[PDB]
Design a protein around this ligand. Structure first.
Ligand SMILES: *[C@@H]1O[C@H](CO)[C@@H](O[C@@H]2O[C@H](CO)[C@@H](O)[C@H](O)[C@H]2NC(C)=O)[C@H](O)[C@H]1NC(C)=O
Ligand SMILES: *[C@@H]1O[C@H](CO)[C@@H](O)[C@H](O)[C@H]1NC(C)=O
Ligand SMILES: *[C@@H]1O[C@H](CO)[C@@H](O)[C@H](O)[C@H]1NC(C)=O
Lengths: 13, 623
């Protein structure tokens, strides 16, 4: 199944 | 007649069949109207006799295993309103004859094996409301121009397909469309300006394509716009000021594009904005103070950009902020204490900036802050004792700053603190015994500081996995209590003033993969129990010390050791004990008193002649 709408994943240090 | 799943007309003829989730197998009354065979785990092709039921207004074959083509005969059903074929193995093209189903409203093709292009015929379907063909990897070509003729379209999604090229200006004719979802596709070229003609647009999802050009200004005239996801494209130019004219906009994600210019002031007018992601772009300028007017912001991610100036104190007006990421920018000035007025903050990352001054103690009064990441700045002053007030602190990184003074005892009040990196700072004094109180502590990196004094096993929590105290002034003896940390994986004490023997209690660290004792004053004889740790795998570095005597015979047991450096010691005798480690990769034996012959095996032949030349008697003997 294709993925539902998502935002850009946040990246932290 | 009356049985379960059957429905009949008033004239007594079967009008409906509905079967949902019965767990079956295999393949599959001219008055029929609605036919649902769904979630039955059926297989085989769709029989083309389906095109014989002329009164069918609903066909739902969804959530099965069906394969083969979508038979052209299916489009003989002139009264069809819903066609639900989604979630199957269906292959082939979508036939042109699809334009024949004059009254189609719902069309669900998603999650199949479909291919080819989308027929120019879709333009004929003027009652079409919802078209969802997404999740077909091989559905290709441009979205047809004729899509503009479906003027009742409220929902279009083509996501996770090979749909390519540029969206046609025709799209501006869909005056009723609400969601456009085409993401993780092959789209390229610019977003057409005509999109501003879609007066009812609410959700626009174009992320993970090759879309180029600039975000059209016309998008500001869309008054119903709520969510905009354009992340991970090639977008260029400045963020349109006119975006601040959409009152209903709660989510903006432009992350990972080529955007330049400034974060526009008009954003202050967005009273519904909860989430702003600009991460990974070229945005210059300073964070405009009017952004602090957005009362509802929970998530602000501006990291990896060109932003300069100071973080505004009016940040305190964002009372719902849970997440603030500005890392990797040109920010300068103090971190504002007023940031402590956003009481919901879960995560702060300001790393990789020019921030300077003290870390304001108020930030440590946040009861929900799990992540505090300030690494690589110009910060200085003390770590405030208030650090112990920050009850949920999990990951703390202060490393790569000018921090001075000593690590405050109150850090020991943090029971959730998992990971702490204070390396590369000016910290002085002892490691405080109270750190024994951090019962969750796993990663501890203090390297490259001015720390000194002694080292007690009582001072460290037994849940420790990674320890790096290297490049400090630490002294006296490695405490026997070191044996109590049974979880310890990597241990690095190098470049200190430590002395005495290696305590045999070292053998009870059953998990230890890496041990670096390099560049200290250690002396005496390398204990036999140091062989006694078969987990030692990654490296063992004993070099630049005063060790004497031979390599203890037990070193033949470390069958997993990949790297071994004993160099620059007073070690004697031969290397025979090592001839049997087939997993030994790097061996530095230089600057010792070793003597004797090495075998001609390829590994010992590998050793540089200059490494042999710094010893007493070492040579290759030919067998
Ligand atoms: C961390 O906790 C301490 C201790 O409760 C706070 O310190 C006190 O603050 C009150 C006023 O808020 C004063 O009446 C007390 O005299 C202070 N007590 C001590 C022992 O210093 C401290 O302000 C908290 N820190 C933060 C940043 O919220
Ligand atoms: C072992 O420690 C010395 C002294 O700190 C260091 O310079 C050397 O690079 C280390 N050996 C390895 C294999 O990294
Ligand atoms: C010993 O040799 C290894 C491998 O060449 C090297 O990485 C390490 O830095 C050397 N150690 C010292 C003390 O120079």
């Amino acid at each position: 199944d294709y993925w539902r709408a998502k935002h850009h994943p946040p990246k932290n240090n | 007649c009356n049985w379960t799943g059957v429905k009949c007309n008033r004239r007594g003829e079967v009008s409906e069949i509905q079967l949902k989730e019965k767990q079956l197998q295999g393949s599959l009354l001219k008055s029929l109207t609605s036919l649902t065979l769904s979630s039955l785990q059926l297989t085989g092709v769709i029989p083309k006799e389906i095109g014989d039921f002329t009164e069918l207004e609903l066909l739902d074959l969804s959530d099965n295993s069906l394969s083969g083509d979508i038979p052209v005969e299916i489009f003989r059903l002139k009264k069809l309103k819903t066609l639900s074929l989604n979630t199957n193995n269906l292959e082939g093209h979508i036939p042109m004859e699809i334009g024949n189903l004059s009254g189609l409203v719902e069309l669900m093709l998603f999650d199949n094996k479909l291919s080819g292009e989308i027929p120019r015929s879709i333009g004929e379907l003027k009652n079409l409301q919802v078209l969802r063909a997404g999740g077909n990897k091989n559905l290709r070509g441009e979205l047809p121009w004729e899509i503009g003729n479906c003027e009742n379209l409220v929902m279009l999604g083509l996501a996770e397909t090979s749909l390519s090229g540029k969206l046609p200006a025709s799209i501006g004719n869909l005056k009723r469309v609400q969601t456009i979802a085409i993401y993780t596709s092959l789209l390229s070229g610019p977003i057409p300006d005509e999109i501003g003609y879609c007066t009812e647009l609410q959700n626009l999802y174009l992320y993970q394509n090759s879309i180029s050009g600039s975000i059209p200004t016309t998008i500001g005239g869309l008054k119903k716009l709520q969510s905009l996801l354009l992340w991970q494209n090639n977008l260029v130019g400045k963020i349109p000021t006119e975006l601040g004219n959409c009152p209903e906009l709660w989510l903006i994600d432009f992350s990972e594009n080529l955007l330049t210019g400034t974060i526009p002031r008009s954003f202050g007018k967005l009273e519904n904005l909860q989430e702003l992601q600009l991460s990974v772009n070229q945005i210059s300028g300073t964070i405009p103070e009017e952004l602090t007017n957005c009362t509802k912001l929970t998530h602000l991610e501006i990291d990896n950009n060109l932003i300069t100036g100071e973080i505004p104190s009016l940040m305190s007006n964002l009372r719902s902020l849970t997440m603030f990421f500005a890392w990797q920018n040109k920010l300068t000035g103090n971190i504002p204490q007023s940031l402590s007025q956003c009481r919901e903050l879960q995560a702060i990352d300001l790393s990789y900036n020019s921030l300077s001054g003290s870390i304001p103690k108020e930030i440590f009064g946040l009861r929900n802050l799990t992540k505090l990441l300030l690494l690589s700045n110009d910060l200085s002053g003390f770590i405030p004792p208030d650090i112990g007030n920050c009850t949920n602190l999990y990951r703390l990184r202060l490393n790569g700053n000018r921090l001075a003074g000593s690590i405050p005892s109150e850090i020991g009040n943090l029971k959730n603190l998992n990971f702490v990196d204070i390396s590369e700072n000016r910290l002085v004094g002892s490691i405080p015994p109270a750190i024994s109180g951090c019962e969750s502590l796993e990663f501890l990196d203090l390297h490259t500081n001015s720390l000194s004094g002694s080292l007690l096993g009582t001072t460290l929590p037994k849940s420790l996995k990674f320890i790096d105290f290297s490049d400090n002034a630490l002294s006296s003896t490695l405490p026997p209590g070191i044996g109590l940390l049974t979880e310890l994986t990597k241990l690095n004490l190098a470049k200190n003033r430590l002395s005495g023997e290696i305590p045999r209690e070292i053998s009870t660290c059953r998990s230890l993969q890496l041990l670096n004792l390099g560049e200290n004053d250690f002396s005496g004889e390398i204990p036999d129990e140091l062989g006694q740790i078969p987990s030692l795998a990654i490296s063992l570095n004993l070099s630049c010390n005063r060790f004497v005597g031979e390599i203890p015979s037990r070193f033949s047991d470390l069958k997993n050791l990949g790297v071994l450096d004993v160099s620059h010691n007073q070690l004697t005798g031969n290397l025979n004990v090592l001839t049997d480690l087939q997993n030994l990769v790097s061996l530095n034996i230089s600057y010792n008193d070793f003597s004797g012959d090495l075998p001609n095996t390829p590994f010992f032949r590998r050793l540089p002649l200059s490494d042999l030349a710094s010893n007493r008697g070492l040579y290759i003997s030919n067998a």
